[PDB]
Amino acid sequence: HVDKKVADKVLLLKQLRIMRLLTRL
């Protein structure tokens, strides 16, 4: 009961900055 595209809009979309946060470059 969850929209697939919404996952992209939060998981993948924010991942762009999340990767920066994880690597801590």
Curated annotation (Swiss-Prot):
Q: Which residues cross the membrane?
A: none
Coiled coil keyword on record = no
**GO BP annotation list:** defense response to bacterium; defense response to fungus; killing of cells of another organism
Its subcellular locations are: Secreted
What GO cellular component is one of the record's annotations?
extracellular region
- Protein source organism: Pseudacanthotermes spiniger
Which function does this protein serve?
Answer: Active against Gram-positive bacteria B.megaterium and M.luteus, Gram-negative bacteria E.coli SBS363 and D22, K.pneumoniae, S.typhimurium and P.aeruginosa, yeast C.albicans and filamentous fungi F.culmorum, N.crassa, N.hematococca and T.viridae. Inactive against Gram-positive bacteria B.subtilis, S.pyogenes, B.thuringiensis and S.aureus, Gram-negative bacteria E.cloacae and E.carotovora and filamentous fungus B.bassiana.
Q: Does the keyword Cytoplasm apply?
A: no
Q: What induces it?
A: By bacterial infection.
Q: What is this protein called?
A: Spinigerin
Q: Which UniProt keywords apply?
A: Antibiotic, Antimicrobial, Fungicide, Secreted
Q: What is its main location?
A: secreted
